Coordinates of C-alpha atoms and ligand atoms in Angstrom, one line a residue:
Chain A
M1 CA -2.3 15.6 -33.6
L2 CA 1.4 15.3 -33.5
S3 CA 3.0 12.0 -34.5
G4 CA 6.7 12.2 -33.8
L5 CA 9.8 14.1 -34.9
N6 CA 9.7 15.3 -38.5
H7 CA 13.3 16.7 -38.6
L8 CA 16.1 18.0 -36.4
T9 CA 17.9 21.1 -37.6
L10 CA 21.3 22.0 -36.1
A11 CA 22.8 25.4 -36.7
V12 CA 26.5 25.1 -37.6
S13 CA 29.3 27.7 -37.9
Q14 CA 31.2 26.0 -40.7
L15 CA 29.4 23.6 -43.0
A16 CA 32.3 21.4 -44.3
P17 CA 33.7 20.2 -40.9
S18 CA 30.2 19.5 -39.7
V19 CA 29.2 17.4 -42.7
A20 CA 32.4 15.5 -42.2
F21 CA 31.6 14.9 -38.5
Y22 CA 28.1 13.5 -39.1
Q23 CA 28.9 11.6 -42.3
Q24 CA 32.5 10.4 -42.0
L25 CA 32.8 9.9 -38.2
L26 CA 29.2 9.1 -37.2
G27 CA 28.3 7.3 -40.4
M28 CA 25.1 9.1 -41.3
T29 CA 23.9 9.1 -44.9
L30 CA 24.5 12.3 -46.9
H31 CA 21.7 13.0 -49.3
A32 CA 22.4 16.6 -50.5
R33 CA 24.5 19.6 -49.7
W34 CA 24.4 23.2 -50.9
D35 CA 26.1 26.4 -50.1
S36 CA 24.2 26.9 -46.8
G37 CA 23.2 23.5 -45.6
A38 CA 23.1 19.7 -45.9
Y39 CA 20.5 17.0 -45.5
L40 CA 21.4 13.7 -43.8
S41 CA 19.6 10.7 -42.5
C42 CA 20.2 8.3 -39.6
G43 CA 17.6 5.5 -39.9
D44 CA 14.2 7.3 -39.8
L45 CA 15.8 10.6 -38.6
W46 CA 16.0 13.5 -41.0
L47 CA 18.9 15.7 -39.9
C48 CA 19.4 19.2 -41.4
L49 CA 22.6 21.1 -40.9
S50 CA 22.1 24.8 -41.5
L51 CA 24.9 27.3 -41.9
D52 CA 24.3 30.1 -39.3
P53 CA 26.8 32.9 -38.7
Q54 CA 25.1 33.4 -35.3
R55 CA 26.2 29.9 -34.1
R56 CA 29.0 30.1 -31.5
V57 CA 31.2 27.3 -30.2
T58 CA 30.1 27.1 -26.6
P59 CA 31.9 25.3 -23.8
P60 CA 29.7 22.5 -22.3
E61 CA 30.0 24.1 -18.8
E62 CA 28.1 27.2 -20.0
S63 CA 25.5 25.6 -22.2
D64 CA 22.4 23.9 -20.7
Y65 CA 21.5 20.2 -20.7
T66 CA 19.6 20.2 -24.0
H67 CA 21.0 17.2 -25.9
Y68 CA 20.4 14.7 -28.7
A69 CA 20.8 11.0 -28.2
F70 CA 21.3 8.4 -31.0
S71 CA 20.4 4.8 -30.8
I72 CA 23.1 2.1 -30.9
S73 CA 23.0 -1.6 -30.2
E74 CA 24.6 -3.2 -27.2
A75 CA 27.1 -5.1 -29.5
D76 CA 28.4 -1.9 -31.1
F77 CA 28.3 0.6 -28.2
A78 CA 31.7 0.1 -26.7
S79 CA 33.6 -0.1 -30.0
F80 CA 31.9 3.0 -31.4
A81 CA 32.6 5.0 -28.2
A82 CA 36.2 3.9 -28.5
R83 CA 36.4 5.1 -32.1
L84 CA 35.1 8.6 -31.0
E85 CA 37.7 8.8 -28.1
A86 CA 40.5 7.8 -30.5
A87 CA 39.4 10.6 -33.0
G88 CA 39.8 13.1 -30.2
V89 CA 36.1 14.0 -29.8
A90 CA 35.4 16.0 -26.7
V91 CA 33.1 15.0 -23.9
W92 CA 30.5 16.6 -21.6
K93 CA 28.8 15.7 -18.3
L94 CA 25.2 15.3 -17.4
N95 CA 24.0 15.8 -13.9
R96 CA 22.3 12.3 -13.7
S97 CA 22.7 8.8 -14.9
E98 CA 20.3 7.4 -17.5
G99 CA 21.7 4.0 -18.3
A100 CA 24.3 3.0 -20.9
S101 CA 25.3 6.3 -22.5
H102 CA 28.4 8.0 -23.9
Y103 CA 28.3 11.8 -24.1
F104 CA 30.2 13.8 -26.7
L105 CA 30.3 17.1 -28.4
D106 CA 30.0 18.0 -32.1
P107 CA 32.3 20.7 -33.6
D108 CA 30.0 23.5 -32.7
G109 CA 29.4 22.3 -29.1
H110 CA 26.0 20.6 -29.7
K111 CA 25.6 18.0 -26.9
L112 CA 25.3 14.5 -28.4
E113 CA 24.9 11.1 -26.8
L114 CA 25.1 7.4 -27.8
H115 CA 22.4 5.4 -25.8
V116 CA 21.5 1.8 -25.6
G117 CA 17.9 1.1 -24.8
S118 CA 14.3 2.2 -25.3
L119 CA 11.9 4.4 -23.3
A120 CA 10.2 1.2 -22.1
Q121 CA 13.5 -0.2 -20.8
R122 CA 14.3 3.1 -19.1
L123 CA 11.0 3.1 -17.3
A124 CA 11.5 -0.5 -16.1
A125 CA 15.0 0.4 -14.8
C126 CA 13.6 3.4 -13.0
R127 CA 10.9 1.4 -11.2
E128 CA 13.8 -0.4 -9.5
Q129 CA 16.1 2.7 -9.0
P130 CA 13.9 5.7 -9.4
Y131 CA 14.9 9.3 -9.6
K132 CA 14.1 11.4 -6.5
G133 CA 10.3 12.0 -6.3
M134 CA 9.5 9.8 -9.3
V135 CA 5.8 9.1 -10.1
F136 CA 4.7 6.8 -12.9
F137 CA 1.5 7.3 -15.1
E138 CA 0.4 3.9 -16.5
Chain B
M1 CA 26.1 1.9 -36.6
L2 CA 23.6 4.4 -35.4
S3 CA 20.0 3.4 -36.1
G4 CA 18.1 6.7 -35.4
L5 CA 17.2 9.2 -32.8
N6 CA 16.9 7.7 -29.3
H7 CA 15.7 10.7 -27.4
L8 CA 15.5 14.5 -27.4
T9 CA 16.2 16.3 -24.1
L10 CA 15.2 19.9 -23.6
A11 CA 16.5 21.9 -20.7
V12 CA 13.7 23.8 -19.0
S13 CA 13.7 26.6 -16.4
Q14 CA 10.4 25.5 -14.6
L15 CA 8.9 22.0 -14.8
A16 CA 5.2 22.7 -14.4
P17 CA 4.7 25.2 -17.3
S18 CA 6.7 23.0 -19.6
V19 CA 4.7 19.8 -18.7
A20 CA 1.6 21.8 -19.3
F21 CA 2.8 22.9 -22.7
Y22 CA 4.0 19.6 -24.0
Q23 CA 1.3 17.4 -22.4
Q24 CA -1.8 19.5 -22.4
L25 CA -1.4 22.0 -25.2
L26 CA 0.6 19.8 -27.6
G27 CA -1.0 16.5 -26.6
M28 CA 2.0 14.4 -25.8
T29 CA 1.8 11.4 -23.4
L30 CA 3.3 11.9 -20.0
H31 CA 4.9 8.7 -18.8
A32 CA 6.7 9.8 -15.6
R33 CA 7.9 12.8 -13.7
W34 CA 10.3 13.4 -10.9
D35 CA 11.7 16.4 -8.9
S36 CA 13.8 17.5 -11.8
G37 CA 12.4 16.1 -15.0
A38 CA 9.7 14.3 -17.0
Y39 CA 9.5 11.7 -19.7
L40 CA 6.9 12.1 -22.5
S41 CA 6.3 10.5 -25.9
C42 CA 5.0 11.7 -29.2
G43 CA 4.5 8.9 -31.6
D44 CA 7.9 7.2 -31.6
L45 CA 9.7 10.2 -30.1
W46 CA 11.0 10.0 -26.6
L47 CA 11.1 13.5 -25.2
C48 CA 12.8 14.3 -21.9
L49 CA 12.3 17.6 -20.0
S50 CA 15.2 18.3 -17.7
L51 CA 15.0 21.0 -15.1
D52 CA 18.2 23.0 -15.4
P53 CA 19.2 26.2 -13.4
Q54 CA 21.3 27.2 -16.3
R55 CA 18.4 27.4 -18.7
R56 CA 17.5 31.0 -19.6
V57 CA 14.2 32.0 -21.2
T58 CA 15.8 33.0 -24.4
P59 CA 14.4 35.5 -26.9
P60 CA 14.4 34.2 -30.5
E61 CA 16.7 36.9 -31.7
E62 CA 19.4 35.8 -29.2
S63 CA 19.4 32.1 -30.2
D64 CA 20.5 30.4 -33.4
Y65 CA 18.5 28.5 -36.0
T66 CA 18.6 25.2 -34.2
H67 CA 15.1 23.9 -34.0
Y68 CA 12.9 20.8 -33.7
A69 CA 10.1 20.0 -36.1
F70 CA 7.1 17.7 -35.3
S71 CA 5.1 15.7 -37.8
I72 CA 1.5 16.5 -38.5
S73 CA -0.9 15.6 -41.3
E74 CA -2.0 18.3 -43.8
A75 CA -5.6 17.7 -42.7
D76 CA -4.8 18.5 -39.1
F77 CA -2.3 21.4 -39.7
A78 CA -4.5 24.4 -39.8
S79 CA -6.6 23.5 -36.8
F80 CA -3.5 22.8 -34.7
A81 CA -1.9 26.1 -35.6
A82 CA -5.1 27.9 -34.7
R83 CA -5.1 26.2 -31.3
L84 CA -1.5 27.5 -30.7
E85 CA -2.6 31.0 -31.8
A86 CA -5.6 30.9 -29.4
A87 CA -3.3 29.9 -26.5
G88 CA -1.0 32.9 -27.3
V89 CA 2.0 30.9 -28.4
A90 CA 4.6 33.1 -30.1
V91 CA 5.7 32.6 -33.7
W92 CA 9.4 33.1 -34.5
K93 CA 9.4 32.9 -38.3
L94 CA 7.0 33.1 -41.2
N95 CA 7.0 30.2 -43.6
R96 CA 8.5 31.4 -46.9
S97 CA 9.1 28.1 -48.7
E98 CA 6.8 25.6 -50.3
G99 CA 5.3 23.0 -47.9
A100 CA 3.4 23.7 -44.8
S101 CA 5.3 24.8 -41.7
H102 CA 4.4 26.7 -38.6
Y103 CA 7.2 28.1 -36.4
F104 CA 6.5 28.5 -32.7
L105 CA 8.3 28.9 -29.4
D106 CA 8.0 26.9 -26.2
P107 CA 8.0 28.6 -22.8
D108 CA 11.8 28.7 -22.5
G109 CA 12.4 29.8 -26.1
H110 CA 13.1 26.5 -27.7
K111 CA 12.4 26.9 -31.4
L112 CA 9.7 24.4 -32.6
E113 CA 8.0 23.7 -35.9
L114 CA 5.0 21.9 -37.2
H115 CA 5.8 20.5 -40.7
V116 CA 3.9 18.4 -43.2
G117 CA 6.0 16.2 -45.5
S118 CA 9.0 13.9 -45.6
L119 CA 12.7 14.1 -46.5
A120 CA 11.9 12.3 -49.8
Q121 CA 9.3 14.9 -50.7
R122 CA 11.8 17.7 -50.0
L123 CA 14.5 16.0 -52.1
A124 CA 12.1 15.6 -55.0
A125 CA 11.3 19.4 -54.8
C126 CA 15.0 20.2 -54.6
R127 CA 15.8 18.1 -57.7
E128 CA 13.3 20.2 -59.7
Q129 CA 14.5 23.5 -58.3
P130 CA 17.9 23.1 -56.6
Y131 CA 19.3 25.6 -54.1
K132 CA 22.4 27.5 -54.9
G133 CA 25.4 25.1 -55.0
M134 CA 23.3 22.0 -54.5
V135 CA 24.8 18.6 -55.2
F136 CA 23.0 15.3 -54.7
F137 CA 24.6 12.0 -53.5
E138 CA 23.0 8.6 -54.5
Ligands
LIG201 MN1 20.2 11.6 -22.7
LIG202 MN1 12.7 23.1 -40.1

């Protein structure tokens, strides 16, 4: 039986700028790097960056909605989002609202998100303002 | 400061076969569904399936190494992999490293993995037998 996410592996086209993005700008902890990868953590999350010459930098309009959201507190959300905008990090657009979120791209065009709130809080919000056709299983 | 992974969103081409795969085959808990998505959990992982007309069923040779690994115990690993094999789930890679991994595809070609073991266990192995160019940060 599955118990959660073991690790997230992102393919990257150039290792050094990606390590710098996740460690220096997003503040994740760097544990190890080698010629073809790096291991970082973000709380409980094990993040692996893997050098892949097949990774292309894709515009957000021609990639699908697959994306990765990181937790941040209400108190830090706005100041962190402002730091990203000031550093020139690019943005993307989702088709729907899902609460307090900031959407941004990594250097290879992976779609990232800062989000405030848990699944339980999301479900409670949706009971009041549901998506079209929403059904709940309790 | 970021405190971990908040949610993982996968773009899907058809909602019903993807719900069947994650809920029934993989055993995740379905919390809600709407006309264009679903919310599931797997342990502490919040998974969102988002219906996206841009999502292509993508062969594994046409996508990069980006992938998502789920936690499982060693005791459960072999029987879970056999279940996937009975259901006809395709494998995209053989495990060639130490530690138990099974690499399988979802119905849209998202690259998934079953893995036994933590980041700390991987770092311990790498300290004994480091990869080419490996540097550690304490
Ligand atoms: Mn999201
Ligand atoms: Mn992996």
